[PDB]
Amino acid sequence: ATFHWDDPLLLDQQLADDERMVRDAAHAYAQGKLAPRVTEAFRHETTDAAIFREMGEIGLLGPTIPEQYGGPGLDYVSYGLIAREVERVDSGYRSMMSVQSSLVMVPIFEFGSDAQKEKYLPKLATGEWIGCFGLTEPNHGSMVTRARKVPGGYSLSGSKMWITNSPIADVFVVWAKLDEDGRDEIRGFILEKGCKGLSAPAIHGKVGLRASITGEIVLDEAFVPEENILPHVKGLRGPFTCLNSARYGIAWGALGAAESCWHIARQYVLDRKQFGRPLAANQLIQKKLADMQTEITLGLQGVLRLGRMKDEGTAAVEITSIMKRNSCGKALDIARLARDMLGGNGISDEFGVARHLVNLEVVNTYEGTHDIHALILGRAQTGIQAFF
Amino acid sequence: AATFHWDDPLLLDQQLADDERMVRDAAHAYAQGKLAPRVTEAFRHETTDAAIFREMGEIGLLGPTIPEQYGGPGLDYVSYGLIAREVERVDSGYRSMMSVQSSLVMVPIFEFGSDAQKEKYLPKLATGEWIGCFGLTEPNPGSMVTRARKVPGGYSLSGSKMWITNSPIADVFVVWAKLDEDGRDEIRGFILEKGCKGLSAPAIHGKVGLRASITGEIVLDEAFVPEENILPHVKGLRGPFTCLNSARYGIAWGALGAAESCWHIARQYVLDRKQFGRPLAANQLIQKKLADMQTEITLGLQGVLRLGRMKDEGTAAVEITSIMKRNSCGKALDIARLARDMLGGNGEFGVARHLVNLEVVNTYEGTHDIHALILGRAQTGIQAFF
Amino acid sequence: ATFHWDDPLLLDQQLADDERMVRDAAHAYAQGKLAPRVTEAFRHETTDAAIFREMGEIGLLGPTIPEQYGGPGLDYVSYGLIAREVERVDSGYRSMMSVQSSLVMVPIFEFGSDAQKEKYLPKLATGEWIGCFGLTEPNHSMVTRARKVPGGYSLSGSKMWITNSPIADVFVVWAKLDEDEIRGFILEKGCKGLSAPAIHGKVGLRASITGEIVLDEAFVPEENILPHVKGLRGPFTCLNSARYGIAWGALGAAESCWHIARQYVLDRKQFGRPLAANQLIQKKLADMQTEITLGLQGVLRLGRMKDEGTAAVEITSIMKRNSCGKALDIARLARDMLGGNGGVARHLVNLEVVNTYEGTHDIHALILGRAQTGIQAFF
Amino acid sequence: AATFHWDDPLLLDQQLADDERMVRDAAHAYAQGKLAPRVTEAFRHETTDAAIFREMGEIGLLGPTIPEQYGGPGLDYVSYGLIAREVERVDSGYRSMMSVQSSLVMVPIFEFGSDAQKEKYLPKLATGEWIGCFGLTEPNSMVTRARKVPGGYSLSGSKMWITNSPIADVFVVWAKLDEDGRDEIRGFILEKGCKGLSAPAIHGKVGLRASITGEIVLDEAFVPEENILPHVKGLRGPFTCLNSARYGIAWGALGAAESCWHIARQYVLDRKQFGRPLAANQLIQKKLADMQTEITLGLQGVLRLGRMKDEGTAAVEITSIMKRNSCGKALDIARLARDMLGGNGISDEFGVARHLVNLEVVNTYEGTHDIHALILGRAQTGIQAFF
Ligand SMILES: [Mg+2]
Ligand SMILES: [Mg+2]
Ligand SMILES: [Mg+2]
Ligand SMILES: [Mg+2]
């Protein structure tokens, strides 16, 4: 049999025909439309908002959302393959899609009323409306953002920390405390961009994820009508369902960025010489290439198996911790190995590696989680918590 | 709704066919019931009970991939893997004995032997009535000095092989030697039988690891081999390499069994032992280590399962074995070291045995990361061995 | 301007002439008298008590103890050099000396009465009496207890994993005394109620004998309590001294592993050239050389600071953690470079114990973390 | 009675002479007073204030080892090291500017120059009145070539990634010269009046953004006879300069590592998780212990090497040990620190991200490959593994 160095376990042959078609559609879009934009977008710290309508047209937004609500009605393995192809170009583009799909469409679909689903989901699916998600606050290190009941609805006050998409978003899913019969309960609210008490100031000066627009959400007596509270969830289950979905996409995405770094490093050491032979002739270099290949190959079997289990309903949430932690950690290690194999300083095409690297350094710590995921798995094995 | 299985997070159990589960359970029953009670004393005093071969043969654990026509159980590669894992879960020495019988003796006779050789040797090897060994390694493949000379009616062999598992109890010896034919010096395989004049197999005592398996030399001083005992259908490196590729697949599964044992022992130990009035398991540094053990085993097992499936389908290139052997052996040794460093006594210390075993397994073939270089050459087209 | 691969920073030039001779004396002894013993001693788990008298006659026991009490009146740098030369042969032998010098002679010298010092120290210094240190118990605050009786104290309890105990003549035992504080007691073998059964079948440190101390109403006369210490300061002073010797010793074992690996890869061939021609092997050799070289600068400096009185106890945590950790890493790298199944294996199993001897948790990391942050993370 | 100094456990301070402590304090006062306020903007916008050379020169930080006879401060290798560490504590870009001036320009003119050249160039380089650069590396043996002409030499070729070149007054360029039957590497001093010399800046760097870098393009650049270095030929010339520079980088990288450690430590004391400081976590304390350990041991290594260089007992291989160790451990520390901060570039603590990309370049300036490991391997085994 013939060896495929770039796909040793023939992942391509473990996919169904429809899945290969989705992967190929996502690849064609990412390489055709995102790859040409990324170098300038990252340099200037901007993003073309047109990307949402482009992705929506191809059916890449809300991959698991049924066709009834304008989604493409795909499964978790297809979601993963899409994330991998987008992040192969840039993690910032993957982040924008993660927010739209897992953090906005998912909670409206899972927890919203029929009216909310019919209004918001078709617009989010086409990318006509851009979404963002407001959860984390400075004091979380539970939450300060508060919905006060007023005639006709709720009045929200508080602020959420750097939210991807917020300065260009049309739709905001915000989690806030609501007094219910004397007790505070976490509830989700849908806000629209024109809300008087809502501001979404942009944040610039980022080191990583510069191709994605990021901002805050600031609420000062932001009125939300009664019909825009998510009726079918309360407590942490709401935001946690979203985060779980998003972390699955990140686990696949990180492997795409790792693959890009590996391919760049391999091509570089083939092209560059030292002492009259390619750098690839050195055992030390070959050892690094072997490690990159091994970890990506194993990582991919992991996320594929997880996707298959999620589609069957046999996947417990702890497995997401295994795979998110493994993909993000090993991807960062690979980007570092690749970076250390390059000479020069940022002018050449190979220094797309430096971009992947700073992106992965943010992604790995965007919640601050390689260590937290370890402790989730520790507790699951031992029945003893070591968080605090 | 879904339950988490900490000991099998990706539900490997559910990825197996019913008949594969049955093979695994039979191997587990045998290893736990018959090898586990022996291992502690066998390792301590460096004794091997040759009866083990007959026990394994009776239940069809020797030469798992060898067809029923020749006395084998006619299983596939995934089954071979599952068996190796269950045996090595007890001890790598026992797995090594099996590996040698199956991949280093039965495989080359099956692949490269004449009809007569297959009919004679394989059924007795399959039952364990005859015990086999594999003579490639010499004291300090292409570098070998063991030599065959053509004589009337056969060959005369002279030379020495070192660190040969099973040799002091072997009935059948597969020996690789150089034969100069047409001025061209090439490797050929020869089948020798115990009692051959000029063949001796003195034992090596005082091993650090793999003490549950008996190992020795093969010393050949003008050992006569009749013409009908040369393997007719192979010349050169393909011969020994085919055997080693088969054995490496089993070791990739086996090492993960030893790793699982170390993980499970470490986990139980840190639940039981206390420091500062809390179980050791309450320490973040300990939980991080347990997370890493779980992760590497879980992913390693997906790798070897997929490789086994590809081998059974005929879609696996030889380079894939390098990925998995390198990963399984390296990660297993890392896990055994992490487990060892979590223990605080001085001889639970099943871990110490697994650790010294894995140190030998990782070093058995080479001192140099040769699998990395196989993979680097496969990616770049450039050779970095010499 | 010549490079010395085996001593790149010329440690030999940073030592004074007396320190160089202490080192050379310990080396001559270790290589002449311990090296021929070690292979069989480790394999069969036998101890020869005469080793203590050999060491004592040379002046290697209690290096920091003054001449007035039988010591050679040396300093911490000298102690370190000795430990390093002994452990270059075997950690088990170093462990025997660590106990004698730091765990037995030190507390009697620092905390004992004049009578205790005059009686015990000269005999410990010559190795004619063998000491052991009873701190560790099965209960991970201690339960060994002294009760005041007419004429002295009655001691009851149990200590575990005590190096030298089955062959010891002198026992420094720490126990709680109700006034409730930890006190130190000197007992002798032959004291009614004291036993010291051996522990057999060890994985590492097999060249050293280890056991328990069992006390069942053992009478200790008033003149055998250490009068000048109470509380944790007693045992902690001893442990701090021992940890310094171990930091040096571990570097000796590491050096042996490095030198064995280097010679091996020069001797063995692959594809018609030494294994040493491979880049992967050279990187490993470079890493071994680097870590040992920097490790030795660290312990040397700490030794000079201890001798000047400028070293805080936390510095010992840095060096102990570093030396033991890096030594084990080097032993493992060296082990993985060898081919066969036969001294690196011994050093490796020894260093695995030495690393875990105090505990499984990275207590020294936590000591340093607390010292940087002001926040406790032990429990 | 001994107190523990967590930030200096082995009391490096007490291992220095009084004059060495004064040099260190002077460098620290300058770097903290004049470089720290510039660095954030300088790195963000990729700008370099050339006034820095004059500031450093007037307090005597340029060419530390150069004798007083030639305008240098007449200090020793330990002092050079201490200065580098104080500058790089602020930024590697600033240390790189100084490394070039001191080790790559003043050192070759001092070691290999005529008395006329030493008298002309060194006093001006020492004050920062003239800024130097060093042209060895080519865009890719050496292709830049000098041809004998009446009155001197005509140089053609190109050098790439040359720190200081777009602001330089003095250019030390290594070129092949075919002369009297042998083709040899020679060193040439070029200046601003040279019509065939240009030095366009390179912008868009990932790391070392606070230091200006350019090319040296030579198109029949005339260099008079009096401007060739007379007392060196072959690789000895540039290698002497690099060996000197590497010593300063070994000290410098420890300064950058110290900054990353101090930032991380302060962050984990200030930031909370589950109601307690991040510093309360065992996982975090382990990382802090590792940072402290490697910096402490690293500093003992570079101090000893400095003492040996000053005594004349240091072989060049020792520089490989320390360069490799300082750069490698510093980069590991910056990555540990980065991974502890998380977030994205906005806060003052993301000075760590700046040190990190700087150290990634400093390690890459060495090569694609662990060449210092192979220098050390050959020195232990007598076997070459470079080819
Ligand atoms: Mg393909
Ligand atoms: Mg507004
Ligand atoms: Mg089960
Ligand atoms: Mg100017």
> What CATH code is carried by the domain that includes residue C189?
2.40.110.10
From CA C197, how far away is CA B29, in angstroms rounded?
40
- Answer with the one of C104, C130, C156 that is the final residue of a domain: C130
Residue in the block written with tokens 């200006």: D212
CA atoms in the 13 A half-sphere facing the CB of C289: 32
* Residue of chain C whose alpha carbon sits nearest to that of A287: C280
Exposed / middle / buried, residue A276 (Cβ in 10 Å: 0-12, 13-18, 19+): exposed
- Whether residue A138 lies within 8 A of chain D, CB to CB, comes out as no
- Answer with the one of D175, D208, D233 that is the final residue of a domain: D233
From CA D46, how far away is CA C304, in angstroms rounded?
46
From CA C195, how far away is CA B130, in angstroms rounded?
54
DSSP alpha helix (H) spans, chain D: 18-30, 36-45, 51-58, 77-88, 92-99, 107-112, 115-127, 236-270, 282-311, 316-341, 351-366, 371-381
Ligand nearest to the CA of B13: 3
DSSP 3-state of C183: strand
Instruction: Tell me, letter by letter, the H, E, C secondary structure of chain B.
Output: CCCCCCCCCCCHHHHCCHHHHHHHHHHHHHHHHHHHHHHHHHHHHCCCCCHHHHHHHHCCCCCCCCCHHHCCCCCCHHHHHHHHHHHHHHCHHHHHHHHHHHHHHHHHHHHHCCHHHHHHHHHHHHHCCCCEEEECCCCCCCCCCCEEEEECCEEEEEEEEEEEECHHHCCEEEEEEEEEECCEEEEEEEEEECCCCCEECCECCCCCCCCCCCEEEEEEEEEEEEHHHECCCCCCCHHHHHHHHHHHHHHHHHHHHHHHHHHHHHHHHHHHCEECCEEHHHCHHHHHHHHHHHHHHHHHHHHHHHHHHHHHHCCCCHHHHHHHHHHHHHHHHHHHHHHHHHCCCCCCCHHHHHHHHHHHHHHCCCCCCHHHHHHHHHHHCCCCCC
Question: Structurally, how many domains does chain D consist of?
Answer: 3
Cβ atoms of B188 and B149 closer than 8 Å: no
Q: How far is A291 from chain C (nearest CA, A)?
A: 14
Alpha carbon separation from D386 to A176, A343, B378, B381 (Å, rounded): 62, 18, 22, 19
DSSP 3-state of D205: coil
From the candidates D8, D272, D285, which should be mutated to test the interface with C, based on the most C CB atoms within 10 A? D285
Question: For residue A336, which of D161, D356, B291 has the smallest C-alpha distance?
Answer: D356
Query: Quick one: which H or E segment has residue C117?
Result: helix C114-125
Which of the 8 DSSP states describes residue D64? Answer: T
Question: For residue A186, which of A197, A194, A174 has the smallest C-alpha distance?
Answer: A174
Query: Quick one: which H or E segment has residue D66?
Result: none
From CA C54, how far away is CA C11, in angstroms rounded?
27
Which regions of chain C does DSSP assign to beta strands (E)?
A: 131-134, 145-149, 152-163, 170-177, 181-188, 194-195, 210-221, 269-270, 273-274
DSSP 3-state of D381: helix
Tally of helices (H runs) and strands (E runs) in chain D = 12, 9
Q: Are residues C250 and C263 in the same domain?
A: yes
Cβ atoms of A80 and A252 closer than 8 Å: yes
From CA B307, how far away is CA B317, in angstroms rounded?
9
User: Catalytic residue among C110, C128, C352, C358, which?
Assistant: C358
From CA C303, how far away is CA C296, in angstroms rounded?
10
From CA A15, how far away is CA A304, in angstroms rounded?
9
Q: How many CB atoms lie within 10 A of CB D28?
A: 17
Q: How far is B312 from chain A (nearest CA, A)?
A: 12
Question: For residue C193, which of C176, C213, C167 has the smallest C-alpha distance?
Answer: C213
DSSP 3-state of C216: strand
Cβ atoms of B284 and A386 closer than 8 Å: yes
Query: Quick one: which H or E segment has residue D230?
Result: none
Q: How far is D346 from chain A (nearest CA, A)?
A: 6
Cβ atoms of A145 and A160 closer than 8 Å: yes
Q: Is C362 left (phi over 0), alpha (psi -120 to 50) or beta?
A: beta
The gap from C-alpha A363 to its chain's centroid, in whole angstroms, comes to: 8
Question: For residue D16, which of D66, D60, D81 has the smallest C-alpha distance?
Answer: D81
Cβ atoms of A99 and A164 closer than 8 Å: yes
Q: Which residues in C lie closer than 8 A to residue A283 (C-beta atoms)?
A: 278-280
Q: Which residue ranges of B make up the annotated binding site for Mg(2+)?
A: 199
Q: Are residues B156 and B206 in the same domain?
A: yes
C177 beta partners: C146, C181
Amino acid at site B55: E
Structure tokens at C135: 């701190």
Q: Are residues B3 and B147 in the same domain?
A: no
Q: How far is B229 from chain A (nearest CA, A)?
A: 31
Q: How many CB atoms lie within 10 A of CB B226?
A: 12
DSSP 3-state of D52: helix
Determine the structural domain holding residue B243 and report its residue range: 236-386
D198 beta partners: D217
From CA B248, how far away is CA B101, in angstroms rounded?
13
Q: Are residues A98 and A75 in the same domain?
A: yes
Q: How many CB atoms lie within 10 A of CB A3?
A: 18
Residues 6+ apart with CB under 8 A from C129: C120, C123, C169, C170
Cβ atoms of D70 and D118 closer than 8 Å: yes
From CA A41, how far away is CA A359, in angstroms rounded?
13
Question: For residue C63, which of C80, C88, C45, C41 has the smallest C-alpha distance?
Answer: C80
From CA A87, how far away is CA A381, in angstroms rounded?
32
Structure tokens at C130: 């063998």
B151 beta partners: B154
- For this entry, resolution in Å reads 1.7
> In chain C, which among 200-229 make CB contacts under 8 A with chain A?
none
Angle, helix D77-88 to helix D92-99, in steps of 10 degrees: 150
Amino acid at site D192: K
Q: How many CB atoms lie within 10 A of CB B268?
A: 12
Question: For residue B375, which of A280, A289, A9 has the smallest C-alpha distance?
Answer: A289
Span from the CA of A6 to the centroid of ligand 1 (angstroms): 7
Cβ atoms of C192 and C219 closer than 8 Å: yes
- A46-77 burial, b if ≥16 CB within 10 A, otherwise e? bbeeebbebbbebbbbbbbbeeebbbbebbbb
Span from the CA of A4 to the centroid of ligand 1 (angstroms): 7
Q: Are residues C110 and C1 in the same domain?
A: yes
Residue in the block written with tokens 């300064």: D255
From CA D217, how far away is CA A359, in angstroms rounded?
35
Residues 6+ apart with CB under 8 A from A205: A45, D44, D345, D346
Structure tokens at A183: 């007790």
Provide the experimental method for this PDB entry: X-ray
User: Which of B135-139's residues contact partners 24+ apart within 8 Å by CB, and which partners?
Assistant: B135/B161, B135/B164, B135/B167, B135/B173, B135/B174, B135/B175, B135/B176, B135/B218, B136/B161, B136/B176, B136/B240, B137/B161, B137/B162, B137/B163, B137/B164, B138/B162
Q: How many CB atoms lie within 10 A of CB A5?
A: 15
Residue contact A206–D369, C-beta within 8 A: no
The gap from C-alpha B377 to its chain's centroid, in whole angstroms, comes to: 25
Residue A367 a catalytic site member: yes
Q: How many CB atoms lie within 10 A of CB D224?
A: 15
From the candidates B276, B280, B284, B288, which should be mutated to test the interface with D, based on the most D CB atoms within 10 A? B284
Cβ atoms of D9 and C315 closer than 8 Å: yes
Which of the 8 DSSP states describes residue D228? Answer: B
* Residue of chain C whose alpha carbon sits nearest to that of A281: C279
Cβ atoms of A254 and A331 closer than 8 Å: yes
Span from the CA of A43 to the centroid of ligand 3 (angstroms): 52
- Please state whether beta strands A146-150 and A171-180 pair in parallel, antiparallel, or not at all (unpaired): parallel
From CA A238, how far away is CA C114, in angstroms rounded?
74
- Whether residue D292 lies within 8 A of chain B, CB to CB, comes out as no
Closest in A207, A339, A346 to D353, CB measured = A207
Instruction: Tell me, letter by letter, the H, E, C secondary structure of chain A.
Output: CCCCCCCCCCHHHHCCHHHHHHHHHHHHHHHHHHHHHHHHHHHHCCCCCCHHHHHHHHCCCCCCCCHHHCCCCCCHHHHHHHHHHHHHHCHHHHHHHHHHHHHHHHHHHHHCCHHHHHHHHHHHHHCCCCEEEECCCHHHCCCCCEEEEECCEEEEEEEEEEEECHHHCCEEEEEEEEEECCEEEEEEEEEECCCCCEECCEECCCCCCCCCCEEEEEEEEEEEEHHHECCCCCCCHHHHHHHHHHHHHHHHHHHHHHHHHHHHHHHHHHHCEECCEEHHHCHHHHHHHHHHHHHHHHHHHHHHHHHHHHHHCCCCHHHHHHHHHHHHHHHHHHHHHHHHHCCCCCCCHHHHHHHHHHHHHHHHHCCCCHHHHHHHHHHHHHCCCCCC
Cβ atoms of A377 and B291 closer than 8 Å: yes
Q: How many CB atoms lie within 10 A of CB C121?
A: 23
From CA C25, how far away is CA A279, in angstroms rounded?
50
Span from the CA of A65 to the centroid of ligand 2 (angstroms): 29
Which of the 8 DSSP states describes residue C225? Answer: B
Amino acid at site C378: F
Q: Are residues D379 and D254 in the same domain?
A: yes
- Whether residue A384 lies within 8 A of chain C, CB to CB, comes out as no
- Interface size between A and C, measured as CB pairs under 8 A: 8
Q: Are residues C145 and C120 in the same domain?
A: no
From CA D44, how far away is CA D19, in angstroms rounded?
36
| Backbone torsions φ then ψ of D209, nearest 5 degrees | -65, -20
From CA D163, how far away is CA D101, in angstroms rounded?
10
- Whether residue B245 lies within 8 A of chain A, CB to CB, comes out as no
Residues 6+ apart with CB under 8 A from A68: none
Residues 6+ apart with CB under 8 A from D344: A162, A206, A207, A208, A209, A214, A362, A366, D350
Q: Are residues A338 and A248 in the same domain?
A: yes
Structure tokens at A139: 């004091």
Alpha carbon separation from B197 to A106, B156, B157, B229 (Å, rounded): 78, 11, 11, 15
Q: Are residues B248 and B367 in the same domain?
A: yes
Question: For residue B73, which of B106, B95, B50 has the smallest C-alpha distance?
Answer: B106
From CA B74, how far away is CA A92, in angstroms rounded?
52
- Please state whether beta strands B199-200 and B215-226 pair in parallel, antiparallel, or not at all (unpaired): antiparallel
From CA D299, how far away is CA D288, in angstroms rounded?
17
Amino acid at site D260: C
Q: Are residues A32 and A140 in the same domain?
A: no
Q: Considering only the C-alpha atoms of chain D, give the largest distance between any 2 of them, rounded to a whole number of Å.
A: 79
Q: Are residues A124 and A153 in the same domain?
A: no
Residue contact A287–C280, C-beta within 8 A: yes
Q: How many CB atoms lie within 10 A of CB B66?
A: 24
Amino acid at site D280: A
Question: For residue B52, which of B128, B132, B134, B133 has the smallest C-alpha distance?
Answer: B128
B148 beta partners: B157, B179
From CA D281, how far away is CA D286, in angstroms rounded?
9
DSSP 3-state of C240: helix
From CA A78, how far away is CA A70, in angstroms rounded?
16
Alpha carbon separation from D373 to A96, A284, A292, B351, D239 (Å, rounded): 43, 11, 22, 34, 17
Cβ atoms of D15 and D303 closer than 8 Å: yes
Structure tokens at B167: 């040799």
Cβ atoms of C288 and C261 closer than 8 Å: yes
Q: How many CB atoms lie within 10 A of CB A277?
A: 12
| Backbone torsions φ then ψ of D77, nearest 5 degrees | -65, -40
Residue in the block written with tokens 């050249």: D117
Question: For residue D52, which of D167, D166, D152 has the smallest C-alpha distance?
Answer: D167
Q: Are residues C34 and C92 in the same domain?
A: yes
User: Which of A110-117's residues contact partners 24+ apart within 8 Å by CB, and which partners?
Assistant: A110/A232, A110/A233, A110/A241, A111/A188, A111/A230, A111/A231, A111/A232, A111/A233, A111/A238, A111/A241, A112/A190, A112/A230, A112/A231, A112/A232, A113/A227, A113/A230, A113/A231, A113/A232, A115/A227, A116/A190, A116/A227, A116/A228, A116/A230, A117/A69
Give the Cα-Cα-Cα angle A212, A215, A218 (nearest 5 degrees). 160
Q: What is the DSSP string of C61-91?
A: SSTTS-GGGTS----HHHHHHHHHHHHHH-H
- Answer with the one of B84, B116, B131 that is the final residue of a domain: B131
Q: What is the CATH number of the domain that holds C44?
A: 1.10.540.10
Which of the 8 DSSP states describes residue C170? Answer: E
From the candidates A269, A279, A283, which should be mutated to test the interface with C, based on the most C CB atoms within 10 A? A283
Length of chain A: 388
Span from the CA of A73 to the centroid of ligand 3 (angstroms): 34
- Whether residue B318 lies within 8 A of chain A, CB to CB, comes out as yes
Q: Is A193 left (phi over 0), alpha (psi -120 to 50) or beta?
A: alpha
Residue in the block written with tokens 């080097």: C330
